[PDB]
Design a protein around this ligand. Structure first.
Ligand SMILES: [Ca+2]
Length: 298
DNA sequence: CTATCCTCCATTGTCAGGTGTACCCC
DNA sequence: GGGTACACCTGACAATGGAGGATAGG
């Protein structure tokens, strides 16, 4: 992959799920103020999905660079402030993020506006720029909080509607899951219950977004993780899966290697619709599918 | 001295893959 | 007497989200 098309909204949504907007503040005395301020737009994915990055680079007029990142990952990064301001900002202005990522990108925009007028090289301009980063991402880490302990983080912005179905496709490609389970049953003639599940995981920040999905897809529910601020919107109900989840993502296809999961998922869902899952032969047919899907892919 | 390229982490939070059992269907 | 769905449980390793450098230009 390298070409494709990518739906503007698919892209936005995918980014709402997987993207980072980074405003980095480096110590270097060779710089007038004592600091280098760099601004980055990053996406990072498994070797599985290098071709997505490629198609993403393409989508953004061919800008940026695709590079080995971690042991098993690759990264697509726009690091040039000009390039960012020229390609990235106008896009995301028109086609707004709807996660709390919007909030990140919005701050990100101001730094790239300060850096634009060159006020960042200036002193107090930096101070403003750090007040921004303060409320971005994880926030300040050690050195930043130490060199700048006097910094009042700037106010975080607010609102939350799904702009387009394709947004959800894209978004789900990032932070969504098509689970297949085999639960050891003690009341079935083949010994195991076959369960399909559809999941979307997300941080409790976006509780309001997630809550809405139930309304949006006309099914599902939200469970909080016992151990943190992790929401799972979930659909376990077979009839809903077959009549709402599948037809949706059939129409608004999944972008990435997860698409291939959705397919094998559907392939099971047929085998379940025909009651063949209570046979040993069709149960087997399932094991193979699931075995070679998700964490066991390629 | 400022801007972009570039090659490298570490930590922990998603994904993903399971249960315990209320309850509907025969 | 066979089969389903919600609520709940739980861990590994990729996704966060960085970290320096080396440049080449003004
Ligand atoms: Ca994420």
């Amino acid at each position: 992959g390298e070409n494709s098309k990518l739906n503007p909204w698919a892209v936005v949504g995918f980014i709402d799920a997987e993207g980072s907007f980074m405003v980095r503040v480096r110590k270097n005395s060779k710089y007038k103020t004592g600091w280098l301020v760099v601004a980055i737009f990053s996406v990072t994915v498994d070797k599985k999905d290098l071709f997505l990055l490629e198609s993403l680079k393409t989508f953004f007029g061919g800008l940026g660079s695709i590079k080995k990142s971690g042991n098993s990952t690759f990264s697509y990064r726009i690091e040039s402030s000009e390039q960012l301001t020229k390609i990235i900002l106008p896009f995301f202005d028109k086609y707004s993020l709807i996660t709390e990522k919007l909030g990140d990108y919005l701050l990100f925009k101001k730094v790239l506006e300060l850096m634009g007028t060159k006020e960042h090289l200036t002193q107090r301009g930096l101070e403003k720029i750090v007040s921004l980063k303060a409320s971005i991402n994880k926030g300040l880490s050690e050195e930043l909080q130490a060199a700048f302990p006097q910094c009042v983080p700037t106010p975080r912005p607010n609102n939350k509607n799904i702009p387009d179905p394709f947004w959800l496709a894209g978004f789900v490609s990032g932070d969504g899951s098509f689970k297949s389970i085999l639960k050891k049953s003690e009341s079935i003639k083949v010994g195991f219950q076959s369960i399909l599940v559809f999941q979307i995981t997300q941080h409790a920040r976006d509780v309001k977004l997630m809550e809405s999905l139930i309304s949006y897809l006309g099914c599902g529910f939200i469970e909080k993780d016992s151990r943190g601020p992790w929401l799972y919107y979930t659909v376990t109900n077979f009839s809903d899966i077959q009549g709402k989840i599948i037809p949706f993502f059939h129409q608004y296809k999944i972008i990435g290697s997860k698409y291939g999961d959705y397919q094998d998922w559907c392939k099971i869902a047929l085998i379940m619709q025909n009651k063949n899952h209570l046979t040993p032969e069709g149960l087997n047919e399932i094991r193979a599918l699931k075995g070679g899907m998700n964490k066991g892919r390629l």
